[PDB]
Symmetry: D2
Subunit: 488 residues, 4 copies
């Protein structure tokens, strides 16, 4: 094979991995130990469920961003008896010391910060490739790439089984999808029933993020979804916490690490005002920026105005603003056309799941443009027309994870305790038909439980309803406390 | 009270009972200002006026009888409705609004400072369409009009068979004794009043969380007599009026009633739902240190993320300067709590009903003394301590009781939803689309409400390309969010 | 006006003129509440009451005649002073406060809604200690009482020599014509009134930025007749009342006058000094998008750091919903600006004098029409456009004119400084310590004011060890900051 | 000499330096170029004054923290004709790439991140040691260490000149001062009139920070101050901007980089509520912490309460709080006694100038304590009594600079344009007696000018007074606009 072939390494115990630097394991462990204290829902899950080993025999593939927080999640799964293989769901989001500690101590991990796209897809394939004993039984996904690979893999395998044909990247004009089809092609040479076996064994997927869940609904709508899915993003204790308060923390962190720019006194544009945009706008306003929101949804627009934020189209503000943040989960928000109008050293970043919110393709092909790397994940692109630049963060990829460390532990404990519950539910319920090849959410009493598990850490003292009071508001003393449609 | 509970009539023969008709010109002046602040309602008049969709309809409403409600009423009449109205609280009426409506537009039975007897008499009047019958449609806020009809029908069933009347001795609740006595008296005049009424009612649209709770109870126990639209739980109602409206009107109520500085104080907000979020926001933004009480661990955790301490009432009762109940529950602030409060602690309620605070225990505490500072600000002094507390609006919703409730712009959001709900029920009167259950308006209409309010504020919306719309799986024209989206 | 400008007298012979003495009981009730909120004043009564330091003193004040000022007045009288008072603005009096004071404690000449003639007559009355002479001491807010004395002395000098009177034709300013006519009339009765007065005045303590500006002008031109203490520039005045007080009372004024939703609007704050900072804070915290105008690049830069846009008025005149002038300057919002404003834009002033907004240009605009919505809320409609603007309190300080001004707690800070200033001037009356110049209170007393207000709020101060105190070069007991510290 | 002797290196042009890694110069230049855009007051100073070379012939020693921002300041001094030698005023505050770029391109620099105290004082001595041509003429100081060394050097030289005696570290129990006296002792062997010559030549010092200015007043009060001083800290455009808004930026940056802890939901204690404490409290509250302030000054305490913050003594909250930040400029704020009461993983940091706000001496000698370094400048100290830890940032040294990058460029341009003005004034005015051996502040019209220079960058449009309006408020159309005693 190739001089530069990607090859798995093995620990002294024989577990596969590929990480940046295994010498970083001790440092990873140190920060993991700190995180544990900040993640009471995960630690409570270990205490409650560890002894009964509910995941005994289960094989779990995950793609949550390979951070210290994810490390605590992984080690909760393993504490509960799972065997685990992991990759990151973005080329820039891995924390190398986290990856090293997990590789050393707990799970197969294929992840490093600064992957090429070919490396990224290879790592995804590896995390899914359990070899002859088969697997996974369970998938934890963030953004849907792992789920996509499986669905596209089954499709390719069907064509191969019927007609002998391999995928051909020439068939697509999308550069990344060419890589995907190439991975699949090569994988047919090693195990051309890989994905069919998986299709038959996988109990379900638990999906972390808004973009991933949109993809799940597309597959359900078109009748292609192969196994049950739990939508973790839309737990209240996920969407209304991680997406909002997480970003309120990690947006400014990414800006400050990447650029050190003063936010106070600047004009910042936030495209989108969903959960992520709300948290980003909040951080920016809190820091002393004057925040302008773009929106397509009149309800979200009206919310922004109630918070004292101006709502305009991008075109209205492109020449004036200092910082741009895309939060939409859509595509084509900041185009080359917009970039050409920006002031010198305008900062352009994306915090939505995929980089196509920003027109990186257009930028890279703009005649005469010059990319000057300031430092990793801070790039100044100089427009020749003006001899002025724009500062792109993380090549348009999720800026919080790419330029900083993403969300903090405490809020990730809320998201990831939902993940643990979701995994437990899929595994425990596998032999009714509680779950069809459809998208489900966790029940409210479990959503409430996640919150309840995090109150003591913060010293929050909850009031107990009397029986009379609970009757009066039509709820049980132990909850759930809100109607099905409650929005919080 | 100097009020005689006999209807008056306009020159045209339309009934009313208000405090002072001389206030009508002033009412009109403030309505004229409110119209500019209520573009959703004005847009509704322009869109639907030519077709007069409420031609021939008879509508009873109970929305608080404010300037804002006047604009709603006059939207209904601009669209062809004949209207009778009452307030849903004894202290929430704005007398000038009532006067202008009574004079110009609709039958109104409402004044600020009703007794409970007067309150229930007004409710009966608003429902009394005379021999001809009615209402066709009900607009309710808190469910008292809906309650009266359901309890009336129940009493009429028993009466028809056994001749038994409701007996007020059956309840120790002073206000419910009044309701049972009103039902008894109505049996003695027309034992089928409410049976006939319920058979003619096309539906009710309900404004507020407490009222919608009641509706869901009636649906669950199979007693609900007619379709209901839950207006509260439109996004453009619950996450605007309940939240931002209270953020405005809570401090307004506090300032008018007491003039107390909020900055530097400790304020307790009991509950952290939509109302409690708005109330806590106002207090914190005014420089108070806010402590939240909650039963729901999700809401509690939200409060902590906003930098608020979450404790039980018992932990802070002697420390706090201001107490605000927002729960929609009962028995939040009891006499036992009151007795521990510092001198001149301010106690108020902004939930729908006054039983959040233990007025009964207060009023019956041996040796207690009430000194009225001014209307709706009372200082109660305890004999044990010789210190006092300040109760606002006798525990009734303080924002409406001590100030003017929410402002026009936010009420335009709420009330545009009410227009849409009323139009839906009425247009569908003969179609069988709605069963005797509780419905919410569809998302495209919730979005329309928002969209109607953007121009006023200069908010400029982006349009999706078809490619972008496809990418996120929505139509270019919406709706833009999944059914279970929480905003 | 129905007011007869003839003094009334109490049973005891003390003069007054108020709107309605029947309001005294209500005044008393609200004063009793205010006392609990004003610990600095109450502490002053406890500390100094036994020694009666103002025994035999005659004090004239012009503080706005509110409940808060009533507590100040009754601190002065608790300490032995005899007091005469007027308000320093035509719309700022609270009639119940005035009544209670008139009845119980001091001569008061004040009502809400004075004409300018009445305003100046009240000022003369507050200064009129009869043949015996007085005042010994003046409490001023904005400098009009001080002005009258200085202009009076000037006119008396000319009169004594040439018999010439002030001629109102010498000014085109309608209000200054009233002042010159009052001086003329007083020459015709007692040509040495103000000469005698100035020789007896121990000093003045001045409350507000505009008043202190005037004092510094008089010092600079050598006309200042007596010592003055600048109370405004105590830290515990300027950086509390002017800032936090307006943060409270600006939204109060807006809400009472108009009930408009602030959230979602664009609001312009002209000026970003202490008052503009507080006003902008309130508006932003209420959900308005605030645009600041400024002439001072430091203040402008501060605003930007707070996330506010800084533009000129001309850039935003047609966009903003609410305009608030805070400058202490003149000619901020002119007729030319008004004409460009959207229908029902709200225009108000919270600086000391109404000439921040061009009332004269408005009132004299051909074909303009004023429609009073209610007292202190006027809608002016222009003939060119047939659209209107809403002027609050005819351009007079809106917080006091449309609401109740600042709350008691913050006014206790301001007014404890006034007590200290008055005690200093009076105790030093015969010592020659103060020249005919403007003085500020020393830092240890500024700190004492703060310290007197901490217990109320439960704020617990740390004590320096002697080693720590030495390390930062301060005494354990303070003062804790260098002379030029800005806080 | 010693195997591990600290020795100056020289550039290819012969200029002295000692930095961590000269290969970092290119990276420093890249970030310097970005900073320049964010520092319009400094760049305007270059444009206005560059051609006239006002500092021709002047030698300037500085000790401003050796950051990218300071690099822009240094290169403004050199653009204006100065020769410059520099050190950092804290062992952890240097940005190594900034130091390298300056060393390479513009000035002698003795600075690295992670200096020992002996290295720190050596670098201070080197920055002051111009060799046989003499110098400096001018000093820019932050915290007063450079000024202290000169004053203590003159004292030692007087004793040496009169009585032949050298300093003896045994004479002091203060470990750091032993190092100082040792430096001075050794320096007497190379030039025993170094400091006397300086005393005679130095035109003045411009002092950056509150602690430094307190020291200057002590020397003025005791009649020991040797040369004029300009107090830059107390320009309005310094104290009310850098100390406040700078810390509002850089406090949370330091916490997030050092620990990644979620601030939202926590209890944070801010000791002191001066300018720095106001900005720190603001950041913490803005981020969703519940902030408790400690104060000795009743005015500052009352301010805090008006902002909705609880004011308590440290003892009231030590067992409950999650984060502690000292802001006092005092000493002995957080003692070992307090530390022993803190919860597991409480974060303890200092943002005041000197580390003695926190009882590091007491901590280090606590029986059985164990220091576990998580990563540089994040240390977990484990108390044996409880088997719980506290997290100390930057060994108690200024946490914003030690754990992150300190303040951002834009606000430092305000501080440092004051520095430029101060230096120009001292140099230009040296031959009257405008300036005695006393502490002075810059006049208000120059303070205003600093602000005015930063408005256009932010798009802020200032109104011009009419002549009539300016008369009415008793100010000139061109300012100054406020009375001498105005507090802003
Ligand atoms: N980086 C992180 O740590 C992180 C955390 C959570 C979620 N995510 C991702 O962030 C993205 C947003 O998630 P969310 O939960 O806020 O979704 P959301 O659906 O709640 O909000 C997205 C918003 O974008 C608006 N929008 C869509 N197209 C737009 C356009 N062309 N211009 C302006 N506004 C437009 C929508 O109206 C909507 O309100 C998703 O990709 C999600 O997966 C990232
Ligand atoms: N890290 C940075 O970037 C940075 C920036 C500016 C200033 N500084 C430094 O920060 C420190 C504070 O500066 P400042 O300008 O805020 O000073 P300041 O004098 O304005 O404020 C310090 C405050 O601490 C309070 N205080 C003193 N002793 C106390 C005690 N024992 N407990 C509680 N409070 C106490 C004082 O009352 C005062 O209000 C100084 O050392 C200064 O040099 C650091
Ligand atoms: N102003 C108002 N009018 C009617 N209902 C309301 N509910 C809250 N405020 C109100």
């Amino acid at each position: 094979g190739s001089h530069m072939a990607l090859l798995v390494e093995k620990t002294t115990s024989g577990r596969e991995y590929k990480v940046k630097d295994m010498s970083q394991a001790d440092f990873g462990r140190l920060e993991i130990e700190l995180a544990e204290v900040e993640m009471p829902g995960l630690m409570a899950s270990r205490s409650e469920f560890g002894p009964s080993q509910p995941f005994k025999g289960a094989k779990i593939t995950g793609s949550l961003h390979m951070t210290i927080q994810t490390a605590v999640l992984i080690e909760t799964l393993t504490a509960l008896g799972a065997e685990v293989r992991w990759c990151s769901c973005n080329i820039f989001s891995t924390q190398d010391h986290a990856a090293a500690a997990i590789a050393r101590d707990s799970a197969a991990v294929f992840a490093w910060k600064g992957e090429t796209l070919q490396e990224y897809w290879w790592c995804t394939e590896r995390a899914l490739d359990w070899g002859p004993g088969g697997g996974p039984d369970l998938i934890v996904d963030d953004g849907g790439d792992t789920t996509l690979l499986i669905h596209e893999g089954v499709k390719a395998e069907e064509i191969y089984e019927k007609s002998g044909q391999f995928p051909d990247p020439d068939s697509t004009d999308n550069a990344e999808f060419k890589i995907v089809l190439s991975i699949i092609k090569e994988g047919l040479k090693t195990d051309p029933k890989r994905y069919h076996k998986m299709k038959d064994r996988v109990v379900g997927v638990s999906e972390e993020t808004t973009t991933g869940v949109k993809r799940l609904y597309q597959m359900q709508a078109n009748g292609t979804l192969l196994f049950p899915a739990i939508n973790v993003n839309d737990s209240v204790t996920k969407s209304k916490f991680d997406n909002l308060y997480g970003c309120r923390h990690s947006l400014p962190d990414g800006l400050m690490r990447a650029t050190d720019v003063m936010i106070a006194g600047k004009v910042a544009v936030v495209a989108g005002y969903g959960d992520v945009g709300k948290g980003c706008a909040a951080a920016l306003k809190q820091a002393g920026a004057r925040v302008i929101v773009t929106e397509i949804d009149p309800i979200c627009a009206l919310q922004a105005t109630m918070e004292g934020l101006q709502v305009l189209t991008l075109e209205d503000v492109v020449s004036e603003a200092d910082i741009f943040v895309t939060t939409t989960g859509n595509k084509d928000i900041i185009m080359l056309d917009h970039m050409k109008k920006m002031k010198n050293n305008a900062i352009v970043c994306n915090i939505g799941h995929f980089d196509n919110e920003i027109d990186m393709l257009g930028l890279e092909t703009h005649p005469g443009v010059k990319r000057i790397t300031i430092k990793p994940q801070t790039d100044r692109w100089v427009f020749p027309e003006t001899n002025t630049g724009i500062i792109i963060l993380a090549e348009g990829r999720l800026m919080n994870l790419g330029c900083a460390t993403g969300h903090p532990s405490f809020v990730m404990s809320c998201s990831f305790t939902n993940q643990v519950i979701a995994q437990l539910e899929l595994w425990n319920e596998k032999s009714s038909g509680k779950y069809e090849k459809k998208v489900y959410v966790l029940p409210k009493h479990l959503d409430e439980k996640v919150a309840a598990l995090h109150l003591e850490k913060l010293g929050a003292k909850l009031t107990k309803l009397s029986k009379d009071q609970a009757d009066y508001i039509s709820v049980p003393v132990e909850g759930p406390y809100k109607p099905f449609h409650y929005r919080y």
